[PDB]
Structure formats: structure tokens, C-alpha cells
Write a protein that binds this ligand. Structure first.
Ligand SMILES: *[C@@H]1O[C@H](CO)[C@@H](O)[C@H](O)[C@H]1NC(C)=O
Ligand SMILES: *[C@@H]1O[C@H](CO)[C@@H](O)[C@H](O)[C@H]1NC(C)=O
Ligand SMILES: *[C@@H]1O[C@H](CO)[C@@H](O)[C@H](O)[C@H]1NC(C)=O
Ligand SMILES: *[C@@H]1O[C@H](CO)[C@@H](O)[C@H](O)[C@H]1NC(C)=O
Lengths: 456, 468
């Protein structure tokens, strides 16, 4: 139970608390509203995780949202979700993490003036290529470095919490007083709260990945809900304490005008020893990238296992047993998206599509409950939780389209474009000799280029 | 499905494909190494940040002189304890200081009786002053005392010998820095003989106690020579003088006055004010107040305003108010002597909820001066203007730039902005936003062209454009 709890905490926690605070503050307009947004997100993710756990214990099949949606709706929705996974959340998430790594590295060099875009983008791409090569090299090395990355991230968070506790003990709580905590510098419209929630929900991303590994624990039914109860509120409290430490370290404008919150925190509170901690945050970003690559490869394996994706994306190396074609494809995709925009827009985009997919799957769970009430479900949840999730999801989506329409519209366009390709790929089963010949030629070319074989 | 067998692939990839992988692996590794080298090369050859100047406390906002406490609150509340309730109002104005007083005991023209170490009981007791400091300190409103030896008499420094006066000032200083004041002000130094030596001594003592204590001097001279003759020995002295007292309603003349004064002193810190203990309205008409207030905040320096200036309060336009200490109008009942003689436009209460009121202009301007890096310590560059225009750029390193155009004339003109008078890093753009205008009828936040712009008579525009 405790080991599973640590698994949930490790999967949920990540380099999101190093990107969120500026975006949350810029929309909330006050410290108290930002903290309320944080705690509300920490509760809503708990609710969604509980409902997802109920869905996962209902269907012992593994594969996450992909498998669950393929089970309830069918092939079309499952392939649409897989398309959204391979195209949006994994590449945008990798690009965001790399960009924040570059920002955090270059901020001490240029403390006041923004670093050049070319250098930051080049550094991010170099880090990404290094990570892709490292993951392609081996697996035991990769997991060892991932474990030490997790150690570095937990060390950074522990030091931040300790410094915050030391500062609050000595009596620096000027901003936390209700006179200054609720000092609104701008009236927040409903869209501003929605965008702040979207920005702040990036830190919790990855809480779905426990369903991706549902087939590798013993007695999931007993430990899993208790695992959520112990883990997620602890994560919310940790994020709350980190935000409190940041706010005791700085002031609203003193924090918003910063490209990297943690490095300025170290340089203004820790003192001469500040140089150590940006390395820690960079190591945390390294770990996030490595974990995302692992989840990517596993997702591609699951996707090509069913057969909507071409079989070339699940083949392993003959010697090292690694799926290099998928890694190269994703590296290209994220390198493409990175040289387009900024961290803020990408975060909004990926969080919106995250919530859209979560709502789609939760609606699928509700449809399964309505259609099929007679199957044995080890755990049962009261309908208030799903109806609350549905109403919050609806309100959030309408607010997202109303306030900032471009990113949600383009995301909807890209996911909808996955329907005709699905119809021409899977629903169209009488492919002529030309299409089959091209497919097999590409298959053989991939085999001879990558030296990979189908897993046994 | 279709795929190549493991044994089949091993046979196929043996003869010549192995060389291809090694070449591709070496090529990809070489590209990564050069890619990292390029970033470091770009980083090394990148422009570096400019150091911050470590501003003191009298740099990030105006000062709010208070000539007389009796007229600031009115009858029945002329006490330091009553003033303690006003600090919420002052913090709304976001002033960074109050030139309070003077409050030392001085009956009439008596050097022996005049004691600068004892607070007159009429204004309150010492405990009230101490309580005032803590409330002000908690609200970050640094209190500056006034130490003019004679304020109830015709001569501010007595007709007798002044050596004993100097000792009294020094004794008052060491005592009052012990109390906890954050500066001092001496007015009417014209009547002080050889005042340069005393100012150097007092500034030496004031800076000796701490590096965050300032001395403010005030004289009524209006020419550049005696002002420089007083600032030749001392360089960290804020001097408020009637240098801009004459208006002339001519933008070119004001442009000359500001530019020459800065050029003569180099680029040292200055204080912009129209007098030492007088309001704006004593030298300007009603339509120019919204114009000067934009000029004083945007110029490089620490604006110094008298009490009742945010509302444009005037004593000559309302009978019963002495010109020296007009009574501040807090509400419709703030002047019970002549009921019905006051309006809602002349009181602070009636202007707090009006976006177009004079006080609203003060509050938004004071906000911009107190936070933006360009207005705080940015370089001030003034280029060629129109026949009666006055314009300048407030730029600082990579931060957002500011442009202000003032039309002191009464005839509508055009911008006529001329290039080749700014540094390469401060070149004007084709399009620039619009922050605020002195008069209603303009669209705020709308990017506006900088070549076909036209000026309404008696209008000042504040525009912002980021780095180009
Ligand atoms: C100012 O104080 C310093 C410190 O003792 C002293 O050396 C200097 O002579 C003083 N200057 C004047 C003009 O009193
Ligand atoms: C300035 O003060 C001097 C000294 O008495 C006086 O002669 C002169 O008239 C004053 N000027 C103004 C404009 O107050
Ligand atoms: C400042 O004055 C000097 C001496 O007259 C002159 O050479 C210089 O051009 C002036 N600078 C400005 C900016 O007016
Ligand atoms: C306020 O109204 C009075 C009464 O008509 C008028 O005299 C005064 O000029 C007005 N003030 C402003 C700023 O318009």
C-alpha cells in the first residue's frame, strides 16, 4: 500500500511547480485566489483519479484511456484518443519541459534581460537529443538515471520547503496577511480564473498513468483508493507550501517579472549557495523528459498491439530491445512544435486537450454505467462525483472557448482531422495492391534501416 | 501483418548497412556537438544586462508636503493623532514621504525661547509623534520633519546672530534622528548667510547617521546661477526652488528651462516642483493643472507636491481661505463657515468615484511612476518638438519605453516628431500604444501612429512602446 502510494506520488509530482506559479499569478490577480485555485485543482484531480480508479477496477484490461475508450465506445474514439496522445500531449509536454529547462539554465546568466530565443531553443533541442539517445542506448541505465533525477527533484522540493519554513519562522509574512494577500491589482473575470486553473493543472498532469500500469500490482482493489487518499491531498499540500514559500520569498510583481521563479528564490534567499539549486531543477526536468519518453514508448507498444497504428512503432531492437522509430518520430514532432511558440500558449493548449480527453473518458464511464449495470464492479462510487466532474468540465470548456478561442479551436481541428485518416486506414479494409505494396515497402525499409524486430 | 524475420533481418543488415548506421550515428553526434557549440558562441557574443542603480527610498514616488496640520484636517482635529487616520488616504495616493510640520516650539521672534528639541503641545505630545511613525513605518510612508527655526515670523532665520541658530539645528538633528525621522527639510535659505557651509555640515551629519536619510533645501531664487552656486559643494542634496514658477504658456520656453537645468548639472538627481511651500494653482490656470501633473511625474526626479494638490485645490477661487494655508476640502461639509459655497468637484469625496476627475489622474500617474522601471531610473532624452510642443522619451536598457507629448499652447497642432535625435537603442517606432490622455475622448490601449498624430489644445499624451 505504501509502495503504491509512493508510486502515485512520484508519477504525479514533476516539473510543473516550476512553471505554474507565474501563469497562475498572472491570471488570478491575488495571492489568495492563486492558493484557492491550487487547492481546487488538487481536489478536482483527486476526484478524477478516484473515478478513473473505479473505471480501471471495473475493466481489468490495461492500456489507460486508449483501452478503456476502445472498450466502451469502439475503434473510432479509441484511435482518436491515441491520435491526440501521439500528436498533442506527449510532444507539447516534452517541448514545454525542455523549454523550461533552457530558461532555468540561462536565467542566472541574464538576470534582468530576457535571453536570446535562438540560444534557448538550441539548448532545449540539444537536451532533447541527448535524452533521446540516452533512452535509445539502454534501459537499466535509463531507469538508474531516472531514479537519481527523482532524487534530485525531491531534494530541490525539500530544500524549498525548508527555506520557506525557516523564513516563516523568523517572521516574514508581510504578503500573507489578508490586507496584502487579497490585494487585487486587477478584477479577475471568469475566463481569467478558467485560464489560471488550466495553467495550474499542468503540475498534476500524469495522474492518469497509474491506469496505464493497472496490470502490475497485487490486490489493487484494496490499496488503490487508500493510495489516492494518502497521495493526492499530500501533493496538494506540498504544492500549497511551495507556493507559500515562493510568496514569502517575493512580491507579486517581483515574481511575475521573473522568467524562472526558483532561481531567483535561491539567489535572493539562499545566498551564495544559490548556484546549486538550478542544477537540481534542471535535473528534475531531465527526469520529466525521461519519464515522458518511457510512457510514450509504452503507449506506442499498446497502440500497435491492437493494430490501429502501423506495426513499425512497436518493434524492439534485436540487441538493445528499444523502439527507436517512435522515439525519432516524437523527437521530430517536438522539435517542430518547439520552434513555433512559447511556454504559456503550449501549456494552455496541452492542458485544454488533457481536460477534453479526461471528460470524454469520464463520459464513457457514465455511459458504461447506464448501459451495463449488471457487471461485477469491485468498487462503487456515488453519482455526485461524476456529475460534479461533468458540470465542472462543461463550465471549464465553455470558458476556454469563450475566453481564448484560438488554441482550443486549433486543437479541436487537429483531433477532428484524425477521423478521415482513421476511416481511410482501419475502416477501409479493401486496400488495393498499390497501397499494400507501399505499406510493405515502407515496412521493409524501416526494418533494414532501424534493425528492429517484432516483440515476442 | 507483414514484417521481416529476426534471422532474415540479421542476414539482410549484415553486408553494408552496418557502415551506414555508424556514419549516421557519427553524423548525428557531430551535429549535436556543433549545436551546443553554437549556443555557447551565441551566449558569449550576446548583449549583457545593465546593472540596476540601487535606488534609495526617495526615488520611487512623490513627496507630499504638509504646510499646516490645522488646515489639513480642519477644526477639532488639528493633532497628530487625528493625522494617523489619514495615512490610509495618503497610501492610496502612494506618496513615499510627508514633509510634516514644522512643529517645534516657537512663540514669536525669540531666539532664546525657540527650542527645536521640544514639540509644541498644540500639535500634540511626543507619544503621538512616536505613534505616528510606527503607523507610517508599517505603511511604508517615511516621515520627513521640517526644521525652519522661525515660521510664525516674517524672517525665517531671525534678525540676530545665526551661529546659535546653527547649533540649535545640529542639536535638533542628533535628537530627531534618534527619534526615528527619515529626513529633514529647511526652507528659505536665502536669508541664511553663507548657507553653503551650513548645508554641507547638516548633510554631513544627516548622512552620517545613516545612508537612507536626506536633507531638503528650499529657496525662492528663480535663476540657474545661485541654484548651481548652492549645489556646487553638495551633490546628494534635494533642492526645491521656484525655477519653473513662471509658465509663459510656451512649450519651447519650458523645454529650454528643463533641458538647460539638467545639462548644467549633468544628469544628477533633482526634485521637480514649482515652489517650496506653494501649490500649483498659484501660478497656473485651471486648464493647465492636468498638464503639469503629467510633466512632473514623467520627468527624471522626485516630484514634490503640496497638500491639496491632487484635487487642484485653490484659495483665490474660494473666499475665506488664506493663500498660505488653505483649508483642505474633505467633503461637502468641510467648510462650515460659508455653507453652500462648495461643490462636489472641489472635494476629494466627490472625485474618488469619478474616472475623469483630477484626483483620478493623480492616482493612475502615481501608480505608473512608482512601479515602472523606465520612469524610475530611465534615461531622459528630449528631441525637437513643434512650435509649442514638448516631448521626451523615458528609456532604460531593455525595459518598456515611454513617450510623453505636451501641448502648452491653445491651438491644435500636429506631432511633427523628428528622428536622428535618439540613440540606436531608443529609436521611435511607427506604431505605439496609448496609455492615458489628459482629456476624455481618446481610446486607451489603442496603438496609434506616430507620424500623423495631432494635438488638441492643452493636451498631454502618455504612450508606451516596448523594445524595438
Ligand atoms: C564630513 O565628515 C567627515 C567624517 O569625519 C569629515 O572628514 C569631513 O571633514 C566632514 N566635512 C565637513 C564639511 O564637515
Ligand atoms: C525672494 O526672496 C527675496 C528675499 O527677500 C525677495 O527679495 C524676493 O522678492 C522674493 N521673490 C519672490 C518671487 O518671492
Ligand atoms: C550643455 O552645455 C554645453 C555648454 O554650453 C553645450 O556644449 C552642450 O551642447 C549642452 N548639451 C545639451 C544637451 O544641451
Ligand atoms: C465642477 O462643477 C462646478 C460647478 O459647475 C464647476 O464650477 C467646476 O468647474 C467643475 N469642475 C470640473 C473639474 O469640471
Amino acid at each position: 500500500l505504501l509502495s503504491a502510494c509512493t508510486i502515485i506520488i512520484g508519477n504525479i509530482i514533476g516539473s510543473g511547480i516550476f512553471i505554474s506559479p507565474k501563469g497562475v499569478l498572472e491570471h488570478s490577480g491575488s495571492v489568495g485566489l492563486a492558493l484557492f485555485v491550487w487547492v481546487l485543482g488538487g481536489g478536482v484531480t483527486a476526484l478524477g483519479s478516484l473515478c478513473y480508479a473505479e473505471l480501471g477496477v471495473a475493466i481489468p484490461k490495461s492500456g489507460g484511456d486508449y483501452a478503456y475508450v476502445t472498450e466502451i465506445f469502439g475503434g473510432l474514439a479509441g484511435f482518436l484518443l491515441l491520435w491526440s496522445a501521439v500528436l498533442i500531449m506527449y510532444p507539447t509536454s516534452l517541448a514545454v519541459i525542455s523549454m523550461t529547462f533552457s530558461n532555468y539554465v540561462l536565467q542566472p546568466v541574464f538576470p534582468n534581460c530576457i535571453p536570446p530565443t535562438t540560444a534557448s531553443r538550441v539548448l532545449s533541442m540539444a537536451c532533447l537529443m541527448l535524452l533521446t539517445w540516452v533512452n535509445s542506448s539502454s534501459v537499466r541505465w535509463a531507469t538508474r538515471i531516472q531514479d537519481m533525477f527523482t532524487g534530485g527533484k525531491l531534494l530541490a522540493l525539500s530544500l524549498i520547503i525548508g527555506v520557506g519554513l525557516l523564513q516563516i519562522f523568523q517572521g516574514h509574512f508581510e504578503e500573507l496577511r489578508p490586507s496584502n494577500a487579497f490585494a487585487f491589482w486587477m478584477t479577475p473575470s471568469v475566463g481569467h480564473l478558467a485560464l489560471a486553473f488550466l495553467q495550474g493543472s499542468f503540475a498534476f498532469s500524469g495522474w492518469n498513468f497509474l491506469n496505464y500500469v493497472t496490470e502490475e500490482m497485487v490486490d489493487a482493489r484494496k490499496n488503490l483508493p487508500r493510495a489516492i487518499f494518502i497521495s493526492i491531498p499530500l501533493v496538494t499540500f506540498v504544492y500549497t507550501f511551495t507556493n507559500i514559500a515562493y510568496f514569502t520569498a517575493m512580491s507579486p510583481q517581483e515574481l511575475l517579472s521573473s522568467n524562472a521563479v526558483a532561481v531567483t528564490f535561491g539567489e535572493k534567499l539562499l545566498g551564495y549557495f544559490s548556484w546549486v539549486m538550478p542544477v537540481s531543477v534542471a535535473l528534475s526536468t531531465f527526469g520529466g523528459i525521461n519519464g515522458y519518453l518511457f510512457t510514450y514508448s509504452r503507449l506506442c507498444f499498446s497502440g500497435a498491439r491492437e493494430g490501429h497504428l502501423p506495426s513499425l512503432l512497436a518493434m524492439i531492437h534485436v540487441r538493445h530491445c528499444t523502439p527507436i522509430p517512435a522515439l525519432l518520430v516524437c523527437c521530430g514532432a517536438t522539435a517542430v512544435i518547439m520552434l513555433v511558440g512559447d511556454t504559456y500558449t503550449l501549456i494552455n493548449y496541452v492542458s485544454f486537450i488533457n481536460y477534453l480527453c479526461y471528460g470524454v473518458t469520464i463520459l464513457g464511464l457514465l455511459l458504461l454505467r447506464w448501459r451495463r449495470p449488471a457487471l461485477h464492479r469491485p468498487i462503487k462510487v456515488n453519482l455526485l462525483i461524476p456529475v460534479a466532474y461533468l458540470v465542472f468540465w462543461a463550465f471549464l470548456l465553455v470558458f476556454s472557448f469563450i475566453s481564448e478561442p484560438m488554441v482550443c479551436g486549433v486543437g479541436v481541428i487537429i483531433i477532428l482531422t484524425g477521423v478521415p485518416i482513421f476511416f481511410l486506414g482501419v475502416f477501409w479494409r479493401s486496400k488495393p495492391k498499390c497501397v499494400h505494396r507501399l505499406t510493405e515497402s515502407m515496412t521493409h525499409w524501416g526494418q533494414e534501416l532501424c534493425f528492429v524486430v517484432y516483440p515476442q | 501483418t507483414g514484417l521481416s524475420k529476426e534471422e532474415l533481418l540479421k542476414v539482410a543488415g549484415s553486408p553494408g548497412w552496418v557502415r551506414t548506421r555508424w556514419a549516421l550515428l557519427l553524423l548525428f553526434w557531430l551535429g549535436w556537438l556543433g549545436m551546443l557549440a553554437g549556443a555557447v558562441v551565441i551566449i558569449v557574443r550576446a548583449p549583457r544586462c545593465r546593472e540596476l542603480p540601487a535606488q534609495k527610498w526617495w526615488h520611487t514616488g512623490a513627496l507630499y508636503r504638509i504646510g499646516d496640520l490645522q488646515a489639513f484636517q480642519g477644526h477639532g482635529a488639528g493633532n497628530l493623532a487625528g493625522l494617523k487616520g489619514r495615512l490610509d488616504y495618503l497610501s492610496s495616493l502612494k506618496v513615499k514621504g510627508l514633509v510634516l510640520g514644522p512643529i517645534h516650539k516657537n512663540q514669536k521672534d525669540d531666539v532664546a525661547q525657540t527650542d527645536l528639541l521640544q514639540i509644541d503641545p498644540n500639535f500634540g505630545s511626543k507619544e503621538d509623534f512616536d505613534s505616528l511613525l510606527q503607523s507610517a513605518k508599517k505603511k511604508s510612508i517615511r516621515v520627513i520633519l521640517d526644521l525652519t527655526p522661525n515660521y510664525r515670523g516674517e524672517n525665517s532665520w531671525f534678525s540676530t546672530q545665526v551661529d546659535t541658530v546653527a547649533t540649535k539645528v545640529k542639536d535638533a538633528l542628533e535628537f530627531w534622528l534618534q527619534a526615528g525621522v527619515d529626513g529633514f527639510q529647511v526652507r528659505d535659505i536665502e536669508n541664511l548667510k553663507d548657507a553653503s557651509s551650513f548645508l554641507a555640515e547638516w548633510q554631513n551629519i544627516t548622512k552620517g547617521f545613516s545612508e537612507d536619510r536626506l536633507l531638503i533645501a528650499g529657496t525662492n531664487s528663480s535663476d540657474l546661477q545661485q541654484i548651481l552656486s548652492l549645489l556646487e559643494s553638495n551633490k546628494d542634496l534635494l533642492l526645491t526652488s521656484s525655477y519653473l514658477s513662471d509658465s509663459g504658456s510656451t512649450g519651447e520656453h519650458t523645454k529650454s528651462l528643463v533641458t538647460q537645468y539638467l545639462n548644467a548639472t549633468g544628469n544628477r538627481w533633482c526634485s521637480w516642483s514649482l515652489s517650496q511651500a506653494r501649490l500649483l494653482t498659484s501660478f497656473l490656470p485651471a486648464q493647465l493643472l492636468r498638464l503639469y501633473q503629467l510633466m512632473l511625474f514623467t520627468l527624471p526626479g522626485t516630484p514634490v507636491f503640496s497638500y491639496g494638490d491632487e484635487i487642484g485645490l485653490d484659495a483665490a477661487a474660494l473666499p475665506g481661505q488664506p493663500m498660505e494655508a488653505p483649508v483642505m476640502l474633505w467633503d461637502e461639509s468641510s467648510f462650515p463657515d460659508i455653507p453652500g459655497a462648495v461643490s462636489a468637484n472641489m472635494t476629494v469625496k466627490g472625485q474618488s468615484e469619478d474616472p475623469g476627475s483630477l484626483l483620478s489622474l493623480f492616482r493612475r500617474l502615481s501608480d505608473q511612476r512608482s512601479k515602472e522601471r523606465s520612469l524610475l531610473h530611465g534615461d531622459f532624452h528630449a528631441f525637437s518638438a513643434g512650435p509649442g510642443l514638448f516631448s521626451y522619451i523615458r528609456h532604460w536598457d531593455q525595459n518598456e519605453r515611454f513617450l510623453v507629448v505636451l501641448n502648452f499652447g491653445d491651438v491644435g497642432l500636429s506631432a511633427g516628431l523628428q528622428a536622428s535625435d535618439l540613440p540606436a537603442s531608443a529609436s521611435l517606432p511607427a506604431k505605439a500604444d496609448l496609455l492615458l490622455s489628459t482629456q476624455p475622448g481618446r481610446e486607451e490601449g489603442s496603438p496609434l501612429e506616430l507620424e500623423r498624430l495631432k494635438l488638441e489644445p492643452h493636451e498631454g499624451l502618455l504612450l508606451r512602446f516596448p523594445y524595438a
